[PDB]
């Protein structure tokens, strides 16, 4: 084409002709500049004063191709650093994009959905500003069809991704009323069968379940948990990862919220998550298990009935370090809230030897956690007089050595608790 590899000054020259077609040629040239793999000259385009011009081409209904090329170019500028996105926002692009959502041309309205994604994705300020200019209704209106399958699927993947950026980020979280407004549509996309729509829906739901409990409540009350759990079942890691993150958020809430996930079947998928060959899934599953072990006795009991304690012993014994840390926490939590039977059982599954092994990590915080894991367990062995039998096993497998040495460690809690234990059970 005659619009390949132009110079910025050419683009300026055409954009300042007063000839709508030359403007179009030069805007298409800018767009192609801005779409190239290595290092598009975003700043020059910005310094040349192009943004107000592009922005005002958005409003030329009479001339749809220029609407589209300007949309795309502005999209790609807005895809840069914050500073580059501020330039696009500062040119007035937001209301002008919101207007293109109504375009009769699907390829143009799709480009506007996409640009607004890049803006909202910068941060909660821009996100909340896209929201204030009215974007949500017309976005939601685009999905108001009896069956999502009839929409082109590039199109649907865009809207979903955009919607999920309106759910994203955190100081502050998105406005409650915006959330209520978006949710029914999330719930529907979360049942659609495109893997990418599903990944992005789960991501939205994870962004919404990362805060305080009223926020989690809003999501739980929509009844998406069963569906999350099924997605947790999914063979595509790009779906499992966000599903697992949303499950994980949700069980940081109340016991009653945690129970919906237990009720939903979640614990049956754990054998497999806790042995997942993706390190990250294994970490997050463990993290999730640790907030389930911080619940009620009868919840700890379900972790027991599902056969998950061996999988924690497993993870304590061999996984990557950060996953072992989370496992330690699952253990300490289990040992605080557990009955005696339960804590006994945990010992019979073989928790002591791999717990001691970790005692020799250079991570000062894991050691504290392990320390009252032991402590809590000693505690329960007192209530059945078994401290002997217990002290022996700890002795038997290198426990006592590392422990005693602990005293000679720089810490307030470390040396206190180690010395304590030794003075209490090993003198």
């Amino acid at each position: 084409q005659g619009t390949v590899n132009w110079s910025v000054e050419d683009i300026v020259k055409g954009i300042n002709s007063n000839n709508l077609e030359s403007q179009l040629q030069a805007t298409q040239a800018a767009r192609k500049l801005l779409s190239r793999e290595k290092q598009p000259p975003i700043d020059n385009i910005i310094r040349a004063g192009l943004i107000p011009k592009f922005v005002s081409f958005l409003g030329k209904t009479d001339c749809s191709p220029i609407q589209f090329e300007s949309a795309w170019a502005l999209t790609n500028i807005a895809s840069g650093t914050s500073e580059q996105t501020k330039a696009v926002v500062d040119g007035g692009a937001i209301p002008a994009f919101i207007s293109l959502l109504a375009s009769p041309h699907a390829h143009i309205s799709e480009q506007a959905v996409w640009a607004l994604g890049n803006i909202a994705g910068d941060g909660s300020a821009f996100r909340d500003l896209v929201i204030k200019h009215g974007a949500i209704d017309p976005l939601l209106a685009l999905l108001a069809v009896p069956d999502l399958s009839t929409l082109a699927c590039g199109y649907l993947r865009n809207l979903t991704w955009t919607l999920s950026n309106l759910c994203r980020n955190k100081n502050p979280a998105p406005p409650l009323d915006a959330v209520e407004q978006i949710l029914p549509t999330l719930v529907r996309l979360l049942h659609h069968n495109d893997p990418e729509v599903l990944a992005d829906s789960c991501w939205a739901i994870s962004y919404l379940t990362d805060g305080p409990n009223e926020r989690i409540e809003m999501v739980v009350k929509k009844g998406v948990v069963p569906q999350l759990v099924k997605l947790l079942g999914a063979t595509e890691l790009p779906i499992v990862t966000p599903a697992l993150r949303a499950i994980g958020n949700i069980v940081t809430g109340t016991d009653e919220q945690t129970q919906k996930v237990i009720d939903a079947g979640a614990l049956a998928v754990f054998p497999s998550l806790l042995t997942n060959p993706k390190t990250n899934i294994q970490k997050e599953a463990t993290w999730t298990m640790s907030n389930i072990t911080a619940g009620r006795q009868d919840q700890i009991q379900q972790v027991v009935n599902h056969g998950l304690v061996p999988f924690l012993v497993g993870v304590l014994s061999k996984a990557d370090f950060k996953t072992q840390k989370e496992a330690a926490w699952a253990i300490t939590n289990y040992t605080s809230g557990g009955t005696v039977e339960q804590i006994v059982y945990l010992v019979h599954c073989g928790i002591i030897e791999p717990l001691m092994n970790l005692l020799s990590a250079k991570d000062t915080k894991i050691i504290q956690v392990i320390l009252d894991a032991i402590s809590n367990i000693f505690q329960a062995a007192e209530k059945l007089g078994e401290t002997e039998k217990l002290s022996i096993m700890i002795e038997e497998c290198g426990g006592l050595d590392k422990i005693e040495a602990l005293q000679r460690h720089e810490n307030e809690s470390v040396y206190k608790a180690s010395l304590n234990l030794i003075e209490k059970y090993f003198s």
């Binding site: 192609k32 801005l34 779409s35 190239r36 793999e37 598009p40 795309w72 999209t75 790609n76 807005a78 895809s79 840069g80 996105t85 480009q111 996409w114 994604g117 890049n118 994705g121 910068d122 991704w161 999920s164 950026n165 994203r168 990944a199 992005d200 991501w203 595509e236 890691l237 790009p238 779906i239 499992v240 990862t241 966000p242």
Partner: peptide, 12 residues
């Protein structure tokens, strides 16, 4: 599987 892009460019 992994994070969702914050921003994306429509590419060549």
């Amino acid at each position: 599987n992994e994070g969702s892009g914050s921003k994306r460019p429509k590419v060549e």
